Each structure stands twice: as structure tokens, then as C-alpha cells.
Design a protein around this ligand. Sequence first.
Ligand SMILES: Nc1ncnc2c1ncn2[C@@H]1O[C@H](COP(=O)(O)OP(=O)(O)OP(=O)(O)O)[C@@H](O)[C@H]1O
Ligand SMILES: [Mg+2]
Length: 1362
Amino acid sequence: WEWNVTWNTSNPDFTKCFQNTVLVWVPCSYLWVCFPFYFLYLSHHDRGYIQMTHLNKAKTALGFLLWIVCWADLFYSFWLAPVFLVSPTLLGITMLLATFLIQIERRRGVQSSGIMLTFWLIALLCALAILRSKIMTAVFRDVTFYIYFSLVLIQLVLSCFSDRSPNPCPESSASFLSRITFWWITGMMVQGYRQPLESTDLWSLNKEDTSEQVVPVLVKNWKKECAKSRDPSLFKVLYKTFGPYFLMSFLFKAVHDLMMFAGPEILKLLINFVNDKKAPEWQGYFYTALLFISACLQTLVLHQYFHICFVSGMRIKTAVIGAVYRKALVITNAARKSSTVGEIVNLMSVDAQRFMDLATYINMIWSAPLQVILALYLLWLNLGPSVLAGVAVMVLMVPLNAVMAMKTKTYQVAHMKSKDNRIKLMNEILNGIKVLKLYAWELAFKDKVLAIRQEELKVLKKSAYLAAVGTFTWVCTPFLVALSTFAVYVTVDENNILDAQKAFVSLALFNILRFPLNILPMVISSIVQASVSLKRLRVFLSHEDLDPDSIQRRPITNSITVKNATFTWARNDPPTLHGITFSVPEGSLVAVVGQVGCGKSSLLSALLAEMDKVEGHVTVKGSVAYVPQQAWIQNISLRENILFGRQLQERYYKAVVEACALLPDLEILPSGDRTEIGEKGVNLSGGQKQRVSLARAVYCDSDVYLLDDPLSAVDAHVGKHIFENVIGPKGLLKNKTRLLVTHAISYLPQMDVIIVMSGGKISEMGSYQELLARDGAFAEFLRTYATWKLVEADKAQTGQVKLSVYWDYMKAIGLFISFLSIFLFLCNHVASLVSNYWLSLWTTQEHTQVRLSVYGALGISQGITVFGYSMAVSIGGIFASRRLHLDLLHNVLRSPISFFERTPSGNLVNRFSKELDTVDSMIPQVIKMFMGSLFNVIGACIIILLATPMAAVIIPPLGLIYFFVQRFYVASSRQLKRLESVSRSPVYSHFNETLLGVSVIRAFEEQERFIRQSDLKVDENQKAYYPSIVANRWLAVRLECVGNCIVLFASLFAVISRHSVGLSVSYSLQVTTYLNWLVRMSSEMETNIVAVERLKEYSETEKEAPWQIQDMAPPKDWPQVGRVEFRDYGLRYREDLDLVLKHINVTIDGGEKVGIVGRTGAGKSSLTLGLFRIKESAEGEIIIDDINIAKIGLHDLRFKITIIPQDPVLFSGSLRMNLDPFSQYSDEEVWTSLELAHLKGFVSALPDKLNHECAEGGENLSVGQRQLVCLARALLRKTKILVLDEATAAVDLETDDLIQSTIRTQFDDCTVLTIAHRLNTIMDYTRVIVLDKGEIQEWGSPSDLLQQRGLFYSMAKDSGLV
Ligand SMILES: Nc1ncnc2c1ncn2[C@@H]1O[C@H](COP(=O)(O)OP(=O)(O)OP(=O)(O)O)[C@@H](O)[C@H]1O
Ligand SMILES: [Mg+2]
């Protein structure tokens, strides 16, 4: 090796020894270092074995022949030079390793080899170099090399084709080149250009990324971790699960850094050749070719690294969602109260996003130091032994930034904890929107949600401040280090030789150092956010687990054999069931009776292993079917609700439908048992829900039935019919154990055992006959008798996002920030341009100091502007997020009830949880980066145009070739993002539906089907998400290669056309980067803008009538008498179907108690909706005290009309907040109301009294005590209209009489419209007006109706009052 023949001569020729040693050691060596490592992948990853094909054999045979040929050389050498022995043998054995490798790759099922193609490629290049040398030299050993080269070339061509496999994703069957270039997606891309993509174009999900193939691994690893540590660390299981696939990203990142650092060196060498005519031209071309191949390989390896990181993040998100769902289905009640529904919704919505953000930057926590250390070491041997001073700066800056970052972790904890409270509050708002709108409590909760949002948005401002200050130090680090090391370098010794050339090199290198330190703030912020989101996930996954071994669920004497067990709702709270002991024989109908909050329902929940056992033995035998007190209904057709995971059996299904009085219900529905039933059963009535919930349990034939009051909402006749045909001894369940919890006693004589439970312990136990002779606590009670698809789905828009969206976001940000931020951007970029100009243009130690001072001033000015615009962008983004949340909340609240009926409660959760996450976090940073890239591009174009008049006809084409591909990419990226969000919404819907009814699912042992449904929905979401990232890589690969094809032309021109412009080579290198970056950023912003678009989607939806009308204002004492009078009133349930009320005309007098009563599906709960303007009246006019209701607003009417809703619902927070959320009543007033509603005897014993912490939706209370709270609210309001929408249904007889007496006493001067199914209360009323089929039938006093022997007489006959 000497420079005369290898570099100095115009003939590019390697030396003979170099040819025979290094050129042969390179390829053989590559396979030797990769071979061992490759077994890891070949072993850990398997796909079967490929069959015997001609291609595989062709490759194997050529591998055998190639080895022979190489050993044939050793034979001829055996037949002086030392290299003529070792080299042929080494090549033969590495060749024997190559053929063995394709063999094992066949065995392990790999169609395209990631090593063979590269191995042959490198071998080919080495052979090409020797080939050219051997053909320039000119039989004996040359012909062996020609045979070797031809065989290697054919082997390389063969290795490109993909072998046979052992609407799927093409990634599995794509060839190596297609996989490395992401070619296989281009079809979708061009498809997205023809017409917008739909969900059907989105391909299927790979088997490796599927939910059922990812979640079980993490779940098993978590069980192992939580079993070894009898507290476990979530980090250990997380990396043990997601490390083997991620280490490839580490390898690719190392290669990308080692190849990127070569780029500037090759550029510098090229710019010295072009600026020199004393070097053989061949050297210049070689430089351009080397730069081109280096840039191409750099982009390929970088984009492989990025794809691996993104895929790992996607898998992490899928695993996190699956594990959260499984734990939520497994969680216990106490932990469920501790870990609110907002916490779970945040865990599978914003937390995984933090993990995928961490996935991109975790690989940089070693790359950035590595680059910094490499640059510092190279400067050590470039400038001298004075760079250590710069080290001191890192020792005086890093700790500060670390201390500052540590404060952010205590600032993100409150940010991610004040988000769960808001999400929980909005979940309770959406679950009980009907009551929250019937009580006019809209702004009472609108001004309450904007009290946890502004607590969550303030810590965001503080964290943004700490992030801007943290990036300030990183942006000023280089210049400060330069100043410190130069101040030391001059004094470190007599080395004051800061010559322009040296100073120039050091300054350019220190500028290069800016790239590793410009990504550190994002890495640190992502690490902090991921640790904050890791703590919460570890806490949630470490909660207490329900124990199904507490109750011996023996399969199949006595079905239930409770043995003095003392159950409790939570570990620390005092027990609720004390010393319960009973034994129910098989088939014996048992009726639990007592009072409100006595433990009747708690007993069934304790027999379901849903309630903690202090001690005792329970042996409920068989399969248990549960009918909850509040019916649980999903969003499917009524037929599937009845089936509930069972195949249809006409013989049984028809009998079940007939028995539970469902034929009358399956005749008024639009299409019988094929109509969409709504998310929460809103399509059904209050009594039909109970019948459907009972039919679901009856169809699922079990051995033990725990009926928690299944006849608490149906009228007397239908209840009798159901009991006789289902629950009685002559029904379908005549040979099944039935714990029929009942409040109103009518079938007690037909009971077998009557459990009288009071206080919490079984106070009495015996049949009807054995309880009439006790003459005690309970005997005196008996003596005294006390198709269209209604729910739609989120639909993506087709086309470009309207600028209106951009305009609304800009208006949300404001004007002052929209100009100050732009000014800071522009000033920063112009300062950078001048710093680059001066360092370059200006390239006398009096000048050296001046140059150093001005450079430091420019760097500090750049840092100041960077910090300033980061602050401005963060503040503007927070302002925009606040405004957007306010607008979205107002739009949701102002929407009518029908909107909530047709929109599933997973779209709203999506807008308020995930889209808001994007608006707060991703959009500001994306806008900042896009603005920076755009301004950089404009500045670079300007500086080229000003300093090069010739380069004026290339700017328009260069802009066009990038604008066209930008459009071609965004046209599909927008639709991919839209489908991602649309497919995501269902997941939230399913999570809410499951979390609502966990108890029923556990009781029916039907967890697997719901787990599979959640897996399917998450699979659809990831099917929508994966093409987005794949298209991201495709766009970048094409752009970074298209721009890289240009620099090649510039380099060649600079070289080939110089004697007959050294700047263009670097200009193309510099500008193309800005152009590509800019394009990417634009697309990114566009995609994120989609989120804002969806937040706007609810604005155009038609809303309710104006809440307050100032022109039409009622007097303060407007309801003087409450003379309700319906004139021609007809209400239509939905616009398509027919009228539900046909020309009713009713004249109610002031203060006259009305007792509206009718059969099921008679439109009883239509006057209640109409009187509150819940649904606009197609025709008719309700007039209260001479003023039409339709003319007044809404809040005026709502506040002044009291209602007791059919479904008792208690919002989260304190018990007081469920009474006066406006805080308009004193403590004494509320306490008087409590004793008025007969609840003071329960709240007093509570340790927190009035401020007791209610659970999510009120499960902390009973169902009768939740109705007593509604009665307390009605007493507190105390208004002259008291429509009772089927109230007092879930309370015992004596409590019913007590609250009836309270209503009769304190509400004897109001126009109360008591809709009820218990006719005994309606008997002592002034008008018992009857509705039958939407038309008026009876009109008069109850006595007149009874004597008329009409419909009401038959109704009186059915109940048992005649
Ligand atoms: N989810 C819960 N968390 C905590 N305590 C609860 C919960 N559910 C019930 N309790 C406690 O158990 C008591 C009894 O409730 P339960 O609903 O069993 O009474 P009940 O008499 O069957 O009610 P109802 O008359 O409405 O049928 C409540 O008053 C409350 O103290
Ligand atoms: Mg109950």
C-alpha cells in the first residue's frame, strides 16, 4: 500500500497485496461477526419452514460450487506466497457458512435475507475492485477469480427474489428491497390519490402486532413479576417484554450515527478537490459516488430505526390497553373506588401515548452523549488540551437541567391527576345528562368542569416554563463552551495560534455539536412524562385482586350454605353484613325482604364474590344468573341482548319472549326484536328494560338465580304474569334456586323461605306460615301492610380540511401571540443566518478577540430568541387548548337529548380525552417545529438567491417537485389519521360499556367474549394506525433519496464542469434537507389539525332552543298556580316514525293532583318530556299560567318545574354536591331536607356526615337511598310543579308510605302529576287520567272511573285494591 498507484495516479488501481488481503477479509469477515448474532433472530423469530423450491436449491448448489472453486485455489497453491494459502481457505469456509446460512434460513422460514443480500453486495463490490485490477493487469489463478465473480453475481441476483411462503399485510411477503424501501404501500398511496380511503382499503393487522398475540405476553410477564415479589417494578416487566425487538433500533442508530459523522468529512474532501486542480479527476468522481452511497445508506438505516421504534411504540400501546382492560374487568370494588373511571380512561388513552413518545427518544439517551463525547474527543486532538474547560460547563449545566427536570415530574403528577378528575366528572355528566338537563344543572357543571381544567392547565404552563428554560441552556451550551475553552486555550499555554483556518474548523465543529444538544429537551421531557405515566400504570396494575376462591363455587342438598360469614364492602370500612347464616335448598324460592339499605341487595353481591369476606364459609353451588337492580343494556339489537353470547334457539327463545310479557313490547317497536336498542337502553322504556334484563337471565339457563327486584318497574298485571310464568312454581324456573329480592309483598304466600333482613343481619327466617305465628318484628308489617341504527358512529370527512379549522385555531391562539412568536422566529433565524454568514465570510489577535465576542453575542442572541419563541408557542398553545375545550364543552352541553341518544358515549369521551391531549401537547410543538423549518427554508432560499444570481431558474422546479409529493402524501395521510380516530372511538365506547356492567359480566362468567370484543376493536384501531407510520417512512425514504439524487448532480457538475461552484455541492446538501424537513413538517401539522377539525364537528350539529330568552321573561313568582293545560298537544318521538301522542286535550286546574296512569308503552313518559321541552312538539301548545311553553326559553322553565326522575342517579363527589351543586342552600336547610326525606337516620352515622364521598354514579349508596336523595332534591327546590316520573319504585312499603305522606303534606299546594304503577297511591288523588295508546280515554275522578267500569276498573282489578 503506497500512494503512488492507489491515489496519486489517474489509474484507480489497488495494490496486489491489498487486493488479496483486505478486499477478501471484508466480506468473509462480515458474515463471521453477523453469523452468531443472526442465530438469535433466527431462533427467537420462527415462521415454519419453506418448501423445496428451485430457487432455494439453485442458491445452495451455487454455494457448494463457490466453496469448491475457492478451495480449488488452495489446491493449485498446494500444487509460495503466504497469502495464497490463508485467503482461499478463509474464503471457502465463510462460503461454507453462507450456504449453511441459506439452508438454516430455509429451515426457519425467511423469504428475504437481510444479511445475504448485503453479504453478496459487499462481496460483489470487493470482487469488482479486484476484477477491474485483474483486467487492467492483462489464466492460472485469474480464471478462478472470474468464475468466483460470475457465481457471486448470479448468487446476488438470486438473493433478491423472495422465496415461497411457509387480505394480509404485504409486509410479511415483501422482498428485502421492498421492505427496506417501503415500496409495497405505494399502491394505497396512489389509491389515496384517486379517491379518499375507506375502512375497507385499510388492510388487516399482522399476526405479530395483533392484540391477542401481544397482550397475553405482557400479562404473563406481569403475573411472573407480581408473583416473584410477594412491590414489583413495572419497568422490569416492560423492558423484559419490549427489549428483544427494540435492540435492533439500537444497532441501526449506532450505524446511522457512525455513517452520518462521515458525511461532513466527505463533503469537506469534495470541496477541497473541486477547489484544487492538482488531484487526478478520478478522485473527485469517487468522492461524489461515496457521498451518494453514504447518504443513501444513512437514510435507509435511519428509517429502519424509526420504523422499529414506531412499531415498538404501537405494540406497547396495544399491550397497555389490553392489560388495563383485563385489570379493570378483574379489579376489586375498593380499588375501583380508589382508581376512578377517569383514571382508567386516562390510562388507556393518554398514558400509552406517553410510552410511544418515549419509544422514539429512549434510543437517543445514549446517542446524544456518544456524539458529544466523540466530538469533544476529536476536538481534543484538533484544538488541544483545553476542551476540558467545556467539560466543566457540562458539569455546571447538566445538574441544573436535571434538578429542573425533577421539578417537572412533581408538576406532571398534578397535571395527570387533575385530568382524571375532569374525565370522571364529565363521564358522570354524560351518563346522567337527562337528569342534569331536567334539573337545569348545566352551567352548575359547566362552571365546575372549568375548575379542574384550569387547575390542570396551570401546571401545564409551569411545566412549559420549565421546559423552555431547560432548552435555553441546551441551545446556549455550545457557544458558552466555545467561549470558555477559548479563554482557557489562550491562557492554557503559549498556544495563541487561533489562526482563521483553525478557529474556522473549531467553530464549524462546535456548530455541528448543536444537533445532539437540540434534541435533548424533548428526550428529557418524554422521559419525565413516561415515568409519570409509568407510576400510575404500576399503581393501577398492583391493585388488590378479586378472590374467587373465597366462595367454594362447587359445580353440579342446599344450593347456598352460608356458614356465619361476615362480609364487608372494603377492608377498612366497618362490615355491612354481620353474621349472615342461612341455607337455601335447591329449587326453593327465597324472597329477601326488609327495609331500604338493610342489606337485601348486598347479600346477592356477596354471594357473587364481589364483596370482601372477613371470615366464614359460603358454598353457592351451580351457575349463577344475576338480574341487577338497575338493568344493564348494551348497544345491540334486543335479540342479542336477550341472547347475550348464546346461539339462538327458536324453541327456547320464543318461550322466553312469551313468558316475560315481551310480545306486547315487541309490537310497538319499529321492527320488533331487530331494532337498535341504544347505548344505555334509552330506546326502551323503564319497565321494558327490566323485562329484557330478566329475559337475558332466563334464556341463559342457570342453576341459581339472584333476582335483585326484577319486577320493580313493571305494573301489577305484567308483574303477576311474569311471576306466574317465570319465577313462580308453575313457570320456566320452577326447579331453579331463586333469591327473589322483593320490596312490595304480593306473592309471599307462594314463597318457600322468607328471609327478613334488617340492619345487616338476618333478623327473621321462615315461610309465610312460620312467620304469621311469630307475632313479632315482621308479622306486624304484614298486618298493617305498611333497523334505523339509532346509535350512529363517528364518520370521517372526505377531502382537504377546511381552512376554517386553521382560522379557528389561530383565533383561539389570539393575535398578540400570533405576531410576537413569528417575530421571535424571524429574529432567531436571521441571527442564525448572520452567524453563519460572518463565520464564513470573515474566513491579528485583536481581530480574534473581536470575532469571538461577536460570535458569542450572536449565539446568546440566538439562545434568547429560542427561549422566547418556545415560551410564546407554549403560552399560545395553552390559550388555544383552553378556548377549544370551552367551545367543545359548550357545544356538548347545549346539544339536545336526541343528540346524546344517537351519539354513543365513546365519541364524546374521545373528544374530551384524546383529541384534547393532542391539542394541548402535540399541536403546539408541531406548530413550533413547522414554523422553524419553514422559516429556515425561506432563509436558505433567500441567501442562495442573493449570493447566486444564476440559481434562479432551479428554485421553481425544486419547489414544484416537492410540493407535488407533499400533496400526494397528505391526500392519504389525512384520511389515515381520520380513520385512526374513527376506529379509536369504538374502543372508548366498549370500555365505558364494560366498566358500567362489570358485575353482570362477572356473574355470568362472560368475560372472555368481552375481552375478545375489546381485542377486535383495538385491532381495528391499530389496522387504521399502522399504514400511517408506514406511509411516513415511505414519504421520507422517497424525499430523502429524491433530494439526495440532486446533490449528486450538483457534486458531479462541481467536479466534471469546473475547469470549463464548490458551494452548490453543500448548498444542495444543505437546502434539500430544509425542503424535505419542511415538507414532512407540513404534513405533520395537517394530520394533527384533523384533531381540531373533530373538535369543531359538534359545532355544526343542530342544538337545543336558546336557554334564556331575555325578551320573554317570566315573573319571579311566575308559577302562581301551575295550571298545566295541554291543547292539541302531539309529540313525535323521532322525526321518521309516527306520532306517539295523538291530539290529546287536557285541562288541569291549579293545585289539582294528577295521577297519570296506564299500561306499558302507552306514552306515559311523554308528557314528562314534553313539559320540560326535552323534545320539540310537532303540533300542540303546552301553556302554564296563560303563557305558552314554546315561547319561553329553557332554563326559566326547567328551574321552575320540579321532577323526580325514574332512574335515581348521584353524581360523583360529596353527597352535598348531589343536593345543591349551586351551593345555594345553607347547611341547616339541607339537614332539614334530609330529615324531611327520612334520610337523616343514615347520614348521621356516616363519619363525614353531609360531606360523604359518593362513588362513581352513586354505587356507594343503595337504590332506595338514591331515590331518597332525589326526593330530598325535590324538597329543596320546592316548586309548584312536581311531576313524578314513576318514582318510589325501588323502596319498601313503609318507606313508600312515609315519602307519600311527605309529598301529600308539604306538596299539597302544587300541580303534582304523579305518574306511577302502584295504583294504591293514585287512588287518593283528584284526577286519575288514563293513557292507553297515545290518546285520551278516561277523564275524571278516581271514583267516577271506578264506577264507570272502564279501563281503570280493570287496572284496579289487576293490582288488588278493588
Ligand atoms: N358499592 C358500595 N360501596 C360501598 N358501600 C355500599 C355499596 N353498595 C352498598 N353499600 C352499603 O351497603 C348498604 C346496603 O345497600 P343495599 O343496596 O344492599 O341495601 P338494600 O336494602 O338492599 O337496598 P334497596 O332498598 O335499594 O334494595 C348501603 O346503605 C351502603 O352503606
Ligand atoms: Mg338494593
